[PDB]
Amino acid sequence: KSRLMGLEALKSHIMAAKAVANTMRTSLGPNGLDKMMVDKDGDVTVTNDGATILSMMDVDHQIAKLMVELSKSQDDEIGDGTTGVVVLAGALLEEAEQLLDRGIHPIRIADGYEQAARVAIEHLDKISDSVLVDIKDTEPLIQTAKTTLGSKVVNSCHRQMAEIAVNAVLTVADMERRDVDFELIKVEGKVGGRLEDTKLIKGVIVDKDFSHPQMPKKVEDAKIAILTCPFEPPKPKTKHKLDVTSVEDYKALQKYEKEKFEEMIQQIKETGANLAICQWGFDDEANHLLLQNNLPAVRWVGGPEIELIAIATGGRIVPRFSELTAEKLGFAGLVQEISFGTTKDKMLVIEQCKNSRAVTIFIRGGNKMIIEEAKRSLHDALCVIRNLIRDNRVVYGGGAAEISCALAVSQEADKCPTLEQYAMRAFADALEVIPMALSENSGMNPIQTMTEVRARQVKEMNPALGIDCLHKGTNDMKQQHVIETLIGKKQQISLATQMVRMILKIDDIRKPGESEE
């Protein structure tokens, strides 16, 4: 019988946490090193996302399995910080070992880590001012997008992706009362092309909808008929009812339905925008009737799909087939065909030259892994900017916010006369793993580099001046362009402390209170 005594039982978790943290600590910030991996199919991908590397590597340890969820919860809600959450969780565990050497009970140290995390999270509301100038904020957003794509996934830093990701959000925020929804920006990424192929889409891309390839595919002028009214008889998986006075009336009813097709065609044709986009669907039996008259229509359109085109132009949607006016039609600037891959298919792109309310980033790749990573680079860039434009709640992380939170925790360790005071101090020290790792990957001495920021934390409260991540040697975050969302840093700390509590819950079956000593 093999028994793991004390630190040996925890050493399994410590080593696994270090095994991942050793790769996460080198990927933090704009100066992070990308991780290249070859899949089981011989597919090479380049990512700097902690979630991707943890999911792609073969899991052989409980920590490696839990860390996947730790990073996944970060990109699903926040985006960036998938590597930072793991580093922080590992640092809390690494310090936990020292707490055990103090003789502090394994559960009591876990209790102290949770208490310190609560204070460190709440202290972020005061860290970093809520006043941001549109012009001054535009620059770090551009630099952030460039480093997010150019240092993490794509080594050539695509100019279009980094610039469009920022302009797509800022250009739409001004026309939407200084707010941005998810329908104003879209990232289009398809496998079948090449990674170097990137295009600027001024509007949105819509997939052509035809019930039969034998029917002619017509494309015309830059006018889109966005209709909610029934342009083709609806059939939501059910059947209509017949109400006729006589057999002759039924024959007249069959002709009446045919006449309705002709009337709807003529009514829209006299107004323009022969491409009808309707949320109502039907079978192919009526779809060929509209196509046989050379009038295409899109059927079974979802809620966000019709709203996406409607918002892209900024016009209205037609509630009734009898009421047709230019104000209820789309206002497109250029309608052209865009190729899908190189040989597979073609998509119809509707661009706007008057109101850029929907800016789409069009990227291609020859590998599913690289296209998803390219989209993730845009996901992080678009999430940070989306929150900073919607609200001015920003955190200057990377050593400034972390040291400030460390002080807030240490102060409680001195105010609280209890046994957990040492565990809380350990948490405050663990917060410094981030600036440490950011300077550890660089040529700078992390100890001497963090010395200035720590001294500044004493001199002034809630500093926005941390260590540089561009290797410039200037201790700032407003000139180094290292900005994150306030909620993002809160999520990183909240998730990391949860990991600690779960692994330092050694064998207690019933959930206890924070028992005294």
Residue 80: closest CA among 469, 357, 482, 517: 482
Residue 162 CA: distances (Å) to CA of 71, 139, 263: 24, 12, 48
What is the identity of the amino acid at 375? K
Residue 204 CA: distances (Å) to CA of 168, 193, 223, 297, 374: 12, 19, 14, 17, 19
Tally of CB atoms within 10 A around 57: 15
Structural element, H or E, at residue 285:
helix 284-292
Task: Name the binding residues for ADP.
Answer: 29, 81-83, 151, 398, 468, 484, 489
How far is Cα 140 from Cα 161, in angstroms, rounded to an integer?
15
How far is Cα 406 from Cα 415, in angstroms, rounded to an integer?
14
In the β-sheet with 297-298, what is the strand arrangement from edge to edge? 225-227, 276-278, 297-298
- Answer yes or no: are the C-beta atoms of 510 and 100 closer than 8 Å: no
Residue 508: closest CA among 117, 105, 8, 11: 105
How far is Cα 437 from Cα 85, in angstroms, rounded to an integer?
13
Alpha carbon 491 to chain centroid distance? 14
Residue 48: closest CA among 67, 26, 68, 20: 26
How far is Cα 172 from Cα 185, in angstroms, rounded to an integer?
8
Tally of CB atoms within 10 A around 133: 7
Structural element, H or E, at residue 103:
none
HSE toward the beta carbon, residue 19, CA cutoff 13 A: 18
Residue 324 CA: distances (Å) to CA of 234, 268, 424: 20, 7, 67
- Answer yes or no: are the C-beta atoms of 352 and 333 closer than 8 Å: yes
β-strand 35-38 against 44-47: which pairing, if any?
antiparallel
Six-digit token string for 145:
């997008």
Structural element, H or E, at residue 249:
helix 247-269
How far is Cα 447 from Cα 97, in angstroms, rounded to an integer?
21
| H helices present in 25-105, as ranges | 50-56, 62-77, 82-101
How far is Cα 454 from Cα 300, in angstroms, rounded to an integer?
59
The Cα angle at residue 492 between residues 371 and 156, in degrees rounded to 5: 30
How far is Cα 313 from Cα 150, in angstroms, rounded to an integer?
32
Helix-then-strand count for the chain, H and E: 16, 13
**In DSSP terms, which residues pair with 339 in a beta bridge?**
346
E-state strands within 389-483:
394-395
Rounded to whole angstroms, the maximal C-alpha distance in the chain is 97
Six-digit token string for 383:
């999430």
Residue 127: closest CA among 447, 477, 439, 441: 477
Residue 237 CB-density burial (10 A; 0-12 exposed, 13-18 middle, 19+ buried): exposed
Six-digit token string for 171:
């250009």
Q: Which residues are catalytic?
A: 49, 82-83, 380
How far is Cα 101 from Cα 326, in angstroms, rounded to an integer?
77
Residue 458 CB contacts under 8 Å (≥ 6 apart), including other chains: 407
- Answer yes or no: are the C-beta atoms of 169 and 378 closer than 8 Å: no
How far is Cα 79 from Cα 149, in angstroms, rounded to an integer?
13
**In DSSP terms, which residues pair with 46 in a beta bridge?**
36
Task: Name the binding residues.
Answer: 29, 80-83, 151, 398, 468, 484, 489
How far is Cα 453 from Cα 439, in angstroms, rounded to an integer?
12
How far is Cα 444 from Cα 26, in angstroms, rounded to an integer?
14
How far is Cα 486 from Cα 361, in angstroms, rounded to an integer?
26
How far is Cα 231 from Cα 274, in angstroms, rounded to an integer?
11
The angstrom resolution of this structure is 30.6
Residue 131 CB-density burial (10 A; 0-12 exposed, 13-18 middle, 19+ buried): exposed
Q: What is the DSSP string of 221-244?
A: SS--EEE-S-SS---SSS------
Give just the sign of the alpha carbon dihedral 45, 50, 55, 60: positive
Radius of gyration of the chain (CA): 29
E-state strands within 391-466:
394-395
How far is Cα 278 from Cα 288, in angstroms, rounded to an integer?
16
**In DSSP terms, which residues pair with 359 in a beta bridge?**
185
Structural element, H or E, at residue 35:
strand 35-38
How far is Cα 441 from Cα 322, in angstroms, rounded to an integer?
67
Task: Name the binding residues for Mg(2+).
Answer: 80
Q: Helix, strand, coil % (nearest 5) of the chain?
A: 50, 10, 40
How far is Cα 150 from Cα 479, in angstroms, rounded to an integer?
19
- Answer yes or no: are the C-beta atoms of 380 and 483 closer than 8 Å: no
- Answer yes or no: are the C-beta atoms of 106 and 100 closer than 8 Å: yes
Give just the sign of the alpha carbon dihedral 169, 175, 179, 181: negative
Task: Look at the block and give the residue holding tokens 């024959």.
Answer: 251
How far is Cα 513 from Cα 402, in angstroms, rounded to an integer?
29
How far is Cα 271 from Cα 8, in angstroms, rounded to an integer?
79
β-strand 276-278 against 297-298: which pairing, if any?
parallel
Residue 229 CA: distances (Å) to CA of 301, 319, 440: 13, 5, 62
How far is Cα 185 from Cα 167, in angstroms, rounded to an integer?
10
Six-digit token string for 393:
């709640």
- Answer yes or no: are the C-beta atoms of 315 and 329 closer than 8 Å: yes
Task: Name the binding residues for ATP.
Answer: 29, 82-83, 398
Rounded (10°) angle between helices 82-101 and 486-503: 40
